[PDB]
Point group: C2
Chain length 174, copies 2
């Protein structure tokens, strides 16, 4: 378990695609950006990551994620949170589109990260096995302060559950 040890950034990366009003005002059709995990973390005092099995799946779309979009405001401003990252292993175009259908207008404090082939997610033991060796993210949530993991929980039944991974539970540790 990763609680209160260093954040194991390694050299892992992710890709999200920007979403903005101000840009919307200024036309750009977005291609994926690449962030180093190590870079994000050592550039922001306070980060929330949560993992989701599959973009557009009922559990993640109705029951898990919308929560974080709602509390985004309380998170950034009251709890001093810096970045909230949503993680799936789904392509960053499908993650951007998913982020949109959910109501996200601005990616400055919220980002929908790909973890290509679950590399990162596996390396912390928070993946979900789906068969013939294919790996999705689990449903989980993680809090990093100062470069230290202060919170990290995995759902036992991600398919259906959203509990230890829920923005509420997260807030409780904030």
């Amino acid at each position: 378990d990763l609680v209160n040890k260093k954040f194991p950034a390694g050299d892992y990366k992710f890709q999200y695609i920007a979403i903005s009003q101000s840009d919307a005002d200024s036309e750009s059709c977005k291609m994926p950006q690449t962030v180093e995990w190590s870079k994000l973390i050592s550039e922001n005092k306070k980060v929330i990551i949560t993992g989701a099995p599959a973009a557009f799946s009922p559990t993640c779309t109705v029951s898990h994620i919308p929560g974080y979009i709602n509390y985004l405001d309380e998170l950034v401003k009251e709890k001093e949170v810096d970045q909230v990252i949503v993680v799936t292993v789904d392509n960053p175009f499908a993650n951007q589109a998913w982020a949109k259908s959910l109501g996200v207008k601005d990616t400055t404090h919220i980002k929908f990260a790909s973890d290509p082939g679950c590399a990162f997610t596996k390396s912390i033991g928070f993946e979900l096995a789906v068969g013939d060796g294919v790996y999705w993210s689990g449903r989980w949530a993680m809090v990093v302060e100062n470069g230290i993991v202060t919170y990290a929980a995995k759902e036992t039944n991600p398919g259906t559950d959203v509990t230890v991974s829920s923005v509420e539970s997260v807030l409780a540790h904030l």
Copy 2:
């Protein structure tokens, strides 16, 4: 190469989620279904399969897929064609959703199939390498008649090009 041999179904299976008119009169809110490639082909006299790299990505979404939906009707009523399968490595929920966004109303003759971990597309050699072990599908088309590949082609620059994989080419070879 794959043309003129028997369809290399082996024992691979894909997943999809249904869309329907009769079940709007019935409001069933579906999960994925499994289909053995082999059975699909055995059950069917004429199958168009096309593979695309990334769900909701610009070439896939704009230049490529619409064609196959555009001409869904002539393929079926003037070209004897039983099924048209769109293949990605994306999740069935992200696929069904992409489908609906392209304006699909029923899965009777079109199906957005997931080939998880690129397993099937790797086995035929139509994969696209994207790094760190990760593979997306390439941009490809293929026709299979009475259990045999009459047509199989792959784009060289799938990121940009909609040619040999176009529904125009498929149509020309039917």
